Amino acid sequence: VYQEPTDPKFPQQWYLSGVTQRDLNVKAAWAQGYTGHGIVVSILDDGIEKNHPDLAGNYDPGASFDVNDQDPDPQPRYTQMNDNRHGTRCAGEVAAVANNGVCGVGVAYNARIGGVRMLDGEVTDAVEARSLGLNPNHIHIYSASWGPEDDGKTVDGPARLAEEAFFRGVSQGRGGLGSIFVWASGNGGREHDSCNCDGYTNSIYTLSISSATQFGNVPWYSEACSSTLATTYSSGNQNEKQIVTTDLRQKCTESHTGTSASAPLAAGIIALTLEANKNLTWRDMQHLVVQTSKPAHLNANDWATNGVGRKVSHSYGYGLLDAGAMVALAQNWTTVAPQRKCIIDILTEPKDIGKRLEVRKTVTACLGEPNHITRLEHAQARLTLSYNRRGDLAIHLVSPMGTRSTLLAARPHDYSADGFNDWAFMTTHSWDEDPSGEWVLEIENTSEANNYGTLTKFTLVLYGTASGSLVPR
């Protein structure tokens, strides 16, 4: 009964559907009746060509604003170099119109799509905050294919206004269910960057999305970290296909690439999921992603099984998004219990790092208290430390269920002597584990240099609930 789109470039959208099994299983969600109708997605980027032949039919001025020039119209600024094409490419991935004889189709081709023009200018804390906090009772899902520089030396995250926007968004946005923030995990692969040094992706309030190539490999630009939640397809080498989407000047491109293309596809899949159950909270959505994402046919050297039997990789999170499985599970989903937060200050004295430091602590995770956690969601190791060359450090955190999260891998370009100032390294890899028991933090010098420093604070911050577990996978 379901008829797939007839758009001229839809056959080239290999990541949406195919018999090959290397796809995001989006046609199966369309066939269940979910195409995005009623859901509102906003692309936070360099603007959106609101009159594009493949976007006009879905464009939503209520999802749009121009923060750079302070006006309602997010139209890109046209230049000879087409610098401001990025947001329009992202928008088409989410919600390009279907069955209109133009280009291809969005994942959620009946969703409403807007854009915030906010990258074409100085991107201040206030600019980010006004973008993240735009019309939060109209916009359901925010997609951000941007962030701190991927030079492999930077440690940077949201400043005060932006962090307040995240908290206000997940607390009061979408009728109190919480804004959905989807983030691209980054393009710093060639610089050996770590997406845990990026406070936007590392945030518990964002769904950080990584990339896989068509042949199922870790792309050259990919950043590994423990905060990544899941993966969608994007570009790879020149024998692998790329992403088909709307381009600047009313054109169609078949060569959209990089981390930038993965977040919009995830945002589209989340739009389909919200259509299947509008009552999902921001935490519900992360649970659905954890439970339904698929490792199979993704190649990595670091796949590990966590304490509840789920495979997890620092390149891929829980694996490829599966749109059909997301919308199926969403329909009868029971809202998760309110989020508990258990704060455990680990150190009794500062500890010299030297060549290697191992800190073991047995915790009760707030046993006997209203914030008792037996079902982990996010875990953070908030670390304050000094060190003479930051990029020589590697940091690992082992859960009581034996799951070893790489909080920080060596970054050869990070020469900083600034250390970490209460930096909240986050891992998703122990999701649904019982956090009671022995946690182990390992800090090691990966170089032959006689480095030196001191760990002065280690706060283990656990988020989660105390009810509703599934039998382990």
């Binding site: 980027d45 360099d46 990258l119 991107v123 294919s145 941007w146 962030g147 520089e149």
Partner: peptide, 4 residues
């Protein structure tokens, strides 16, 4: 910073 912030980059695309």
């Amino acid at each position: 910073x912030r980059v695309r």
